[PDB]
Design a protein around this ligand. Structure first.
Ligand code: NOM
Lengths: 112, 112
């Protein structure tokens, strides 16, 4: 969705500390892999965008949700998200556990 | 821009440490208050979205740029960015200097 789409009521920014670019690409490919296709139909899910920090030390997901309940229950209570957590957590190269910051969009500066 | 738009070549995630929600609100009102009206027309700028963290301790900007060069030239080497930063670090309740993470979008999951 557009960064300022008014449907976005809740964002999760999740950072995975990784040992380098190879693991960045390996973490990227695994979490956008095709097997994770059920997230696409999760109700209230708006988007998950994965990024590679420029210094090769991290993968950051900026995820857009309709609400905190959508993220917490619709996605989170589903057994497959537990499956997903372990998977990304067992990846060689991860240098620690992901760190998540939860937030609400409050204002946007866009071009006219 | 859409979060998954292929014109997004560079992202800056800027986290500002604040003393609570009333300062979260004042910093967002400050950042979308006319102080950076100039940024909107700059070549390469795609968006700056300011969010309040749910725990009350931070304001996070997810900023989209067409490329790093556009960011370095059009924003980093414009003296108005130092002016922006002086205005943002003049706010009471701002607990420390902003922390920035540079990165590139790699993969994305959009809704079904
Ligand atoms: C990286 C950067 O550093 C910050 C320090 C500050 O005080 O305001 C900053 C700041 C930074 C930035 O990248 C940035 C951007 O891409 C788009 C919009 C606004 C900012 C911004 O306000």
């Amino acid at each position: 969705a557009e960064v300022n789409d008014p449907r976005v009521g809740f964002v999760a920014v999740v950072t995975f500390p990784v040992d380098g670019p190879a693991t960045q690409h390996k973490l990227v490919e695994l979490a956008t892999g095709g097997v994770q296709e059920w997230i696409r139909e999760v109700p209230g899910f708006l988007s998950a965008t994965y990024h590679a920090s420029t210094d090769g030390t991290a993968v950051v997901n900026y995820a857009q949700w309709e609400s905190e309940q959508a993220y917490r229950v619709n996605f989170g209570a589903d057994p497959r998200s537990a499956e997903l957590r372990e998977a990304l957590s067992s990846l060689p190269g991860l240098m620690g556990p992901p760190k998540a910051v939860f937030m609400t969009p409050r204002g946007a500066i866009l071009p006219s």
